[PDB]
Amino acid sequence: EDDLKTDFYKDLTSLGHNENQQGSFSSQGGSSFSYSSKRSENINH
């Protein structure tokens, strides 16, 4: 008798994630008054 039973199992299960975000916000308020006055504003978020 010469039984030779053999088995091989291989699993490769790879997962990958890609995530990239940019946000830009800007506000530039202002006001003018003729007495005289001036206002200026800037925002860069």
Short mmCIF file of C-alpha atoms in Angstrom, two decimals:
data_model
loop_
_atom_site.label_atom_id
_atom_site.label_comp_id
_atom_site.label_asym_id
_atom_site.label_seq_id
_atom_site.Cartn_x
_atom_site.Cartn_y
_atom_site.Cartn_z
CA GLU A 1 0.00 0.00 0.00
CA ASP A 2 1.20 3.53 -0.79
CA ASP A 3 -1.27 6.28 0.09
CA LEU A 4 0.01 9.84 -0.37
CA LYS A 5 -2.72 12.41 0.32
CA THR A 6 -1.66 16.05 0.42
CA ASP A 7 -3.40 19.43 0.41
CA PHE A 8 -2.33 23.08 0.36
CA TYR A 9 -4.49 26.14 1.06
CA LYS A 10 -3.31 29.74 0.69
CA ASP A 11 -5.35 32.90 1.30
CA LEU A 12 -4.13 36.43 0.58
CA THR A 13 -6.70 39.13 1.41
CA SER A 14 -5.34 42.68 1.11
CA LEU A 15 -7.29 45.89 1.72
CA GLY A 16 -6.20 49.47 1.09
CA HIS A 17 -7.63 52.93 1.78
CA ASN A 18 -7.05 56.30 0.10
CA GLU A 19 -8.28 59.53 1.70
CA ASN A 20 -7.19 63.08 0.89
CA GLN A 21 -9.11 66.33 1.46
CA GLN A 22 -8.38 70.05 1.28
CA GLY A 23 -10.67 72.85 2.39
CA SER A 24 -10.18 76.57 1.85
CA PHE A 25 -12.44 79.39 3.06
CA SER A 26 -11.91 83.15 2.89
CA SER A 27 -13.98 86.17 3.92
CA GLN A 28 -12.96 89.81 3.42
CA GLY A 29 -15.43 92.13 5.14
CA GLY A 30 -15.11 95.89 5.13
CA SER A 31 -16.88 99.20 5.60
CA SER A 32 -16.43 102.85 4.64
CA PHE A 33 -17.60 106.00 6.43
CA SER A 34 -17.25 109.45 4.88
CA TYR A 35 -15.94 112.68 10.55
CA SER A 36 -14.23 109.81 8.74
CA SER A 37 -13.67 106.14 9.51
CA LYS A 38 -12.46 103.01 7.73
CA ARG A 39 -12.69 99.30 8.52
CA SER A 40 -10.92 96.37 6.84
CA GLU A 41 -11.10 92.64 7.56
CA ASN A 42 -9.60 89.46 6.14
CA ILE A 43 -10.02 85.76 6.92
CA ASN A 44 -8.12 82.79 5.46
CA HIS A 45 -9.32 79.44 6.84
#
